Amino acid sequence: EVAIGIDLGTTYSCVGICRNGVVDIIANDQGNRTTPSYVAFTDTERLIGDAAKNQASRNPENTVFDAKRLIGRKFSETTVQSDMKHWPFTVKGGSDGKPMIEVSYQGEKKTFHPEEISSMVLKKMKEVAETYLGKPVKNAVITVPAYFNDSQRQATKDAGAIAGLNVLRIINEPTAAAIAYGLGGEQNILIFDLGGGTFDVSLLTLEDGIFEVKATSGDTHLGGEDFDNKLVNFCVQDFKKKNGGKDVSKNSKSLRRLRTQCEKAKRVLSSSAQATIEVDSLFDGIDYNVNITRAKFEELCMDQFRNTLIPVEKVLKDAKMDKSQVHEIVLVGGSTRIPKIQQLIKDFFNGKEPCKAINPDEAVAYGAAVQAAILSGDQSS
Numbered sequence: 001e002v003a004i005g006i007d008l009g010t011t012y013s014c015v016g017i018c019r020n021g022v023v024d025i026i027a028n029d030q031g032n033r034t035t036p037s038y039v040a041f042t043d044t045e046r047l048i049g050d051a052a053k054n055q056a057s058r059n060p061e062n063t064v065f066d067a068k069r070l071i072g073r074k075f076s077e078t079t080v081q082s083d084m085k086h087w088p089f090t091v092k093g094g095s096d097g098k099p100m101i102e103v104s105y106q107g108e109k110k111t112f113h114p115e116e117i118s119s120m121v122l123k124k125m126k127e128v129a130e131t132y133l134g135k136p137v138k139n140a141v142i143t144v145p146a147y148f149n150d151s152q153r154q155a156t157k158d159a160g161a162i163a164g165l166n167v168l169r170i171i172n173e174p175t176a177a178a179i180a181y182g183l184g185g186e187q188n189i190l191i192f193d194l195g196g197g198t199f200d201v202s203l204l205t206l207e208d209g210i211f212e213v214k215a216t217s218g219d220t221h222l223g224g225e226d227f228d229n230k231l232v233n234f235c236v237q238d239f240k241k242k243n244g245g246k247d248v249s250k251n252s253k254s255l256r257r258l259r260t261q262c263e264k265a266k267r268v269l270s271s272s273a274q275a276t277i278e279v280d281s282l283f284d285g286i287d288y289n290v291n292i293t294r295a296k297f298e299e300l301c302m303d304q305f306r307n308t309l310i311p312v313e314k315v316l317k318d319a320k321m322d323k324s325q326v327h328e329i330v331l332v333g334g335s336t337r338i339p340k341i342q343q344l345i346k347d348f349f350n351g352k353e354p355c356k357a358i359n360p361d362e363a364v365a366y367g368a369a370v371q372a373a374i375l376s377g378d379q380s381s
């Protein structure tokens with residue numbers, strides 16, 4: 001009878017439950033309200049979530065992420081050829097044309113389909129809910145991007161079945177976000193979703209409790225990781241100017257340790273004017289330290305931030321509607337916490353305040369949890 005909503009994110013996943021028309025987003029074992037979509041294999045164990053992400057730089061070959069970029073795709077697809085330059089783990093095509101992710105686990109070569117890796121993240125999110133509820137969970141609504149095709153949706157559903165979930169429904173991420181905010185006649189809703197890996201803009205219409213996706217645009221390779229990379233590239237150049245041209249970029253472990261700290265500084269800069277990036281013994285036993293102002297971060301990311309408005313203009317053009325006709329702008333995704341992004345969007349919409357009351361990296365799971373409760377016969381929301 002217990003049903004949960006799950007955001008299966010490219011970078012971070014999130015689980016919620018709606019009971020008595022109230023939605024709890026469930027914290028994991030480390031107290032985090034979102035969980036990295038990471039799976040690692042070591043000599044002794046299978047790590048999922050925070051524990052997998054935290055040892056990525058010590059075990060790059062056997063730490064799997066971005067399975068969402070492979071799920072329901074043929075290995076020969078041009079998106080896979082393009083994306084695989086980003087992965088330190090091995091991916092090969094099977095005789096059925098399906099990607100096979102190859103790792104070493106307890107001294108043995110093992111291969112997994114993308115939906116098997118995604119099943120392990122879903123199983124972790126199921127266990128997070130079960131620990132909180134102190135009861136087994138069987139039923140779930142799982143979200144997917146609006147642009148997901150029938151193969152990607154069915155592979156996501158299969159991941160749920162492998163994780164031990166009865167998948168009540170697959171619903172669109174942008175629709176889930178709109179459902180979270182309870183969005184009176186006809187309403188034009190823009191979902192601006194900027195996560196860790198991807199940027200999705202969706203224009204929805206809502207007449208008589210019925211959502212339709214009118215238009216979608218974005219960039220499958222713009223997200224928080226790209227802003228982290230802007231800080232990494234700066235720090236690499238800054239280290240050169242401090243340490244007689246020495247090049248941190250030659251050491252992939254040095255880059256990963258630097259990237260981890262750039263991501264932390266980026267988060268601090270969403271609520272402070274300044275942050276420190278610090279890595280003890282970064283490269284050649286040399287300590288690295290630098291102070292980054294919010295202004296410098298904004299400068300490094302200036303083009304990427306401003307270009308987020310281009311897909312906004314494109315969905316409005318495709319829907320043949322003026323920005324003045326948008327009733328709600330919903331901020332979704334962890335990167336929408338960046339003040340400069342919030343200011344650019346507000347200014348574009350002529351000072352209209354976006355809907356951002358729900359922690360933006362939780363809104364999709366929140367909506368999924370509402371839909372899961374409704375489809376279980378609970379009319380309280």
Ligand SMILES: Nc1ncnc2c1ncn2[C@@H]1O[C@H](COP(=O)(O)OP(=O)(O)NP(=O)(O)O)[C@@H](O)[C@H]1O
Nearest residue numbers: 009010011012195196197198224270333334335361
């Ligand atoms: N306070 C913050 N300031 C800036 N970025 C943040 C903040 N909190 C989290 N993030 C970033 O949010 C991103 C993760 O967004 P999230 O919406 O959880 O991912 P997702 O659901 O997996 N989306 P996607 O990766 O696009 O599929 C990471 O790049 C984080 O660094």
Ligand SMILES: [Mg+2]
Nearest residue numbers: 009010195198
């Ligand atoms: Mg996503």
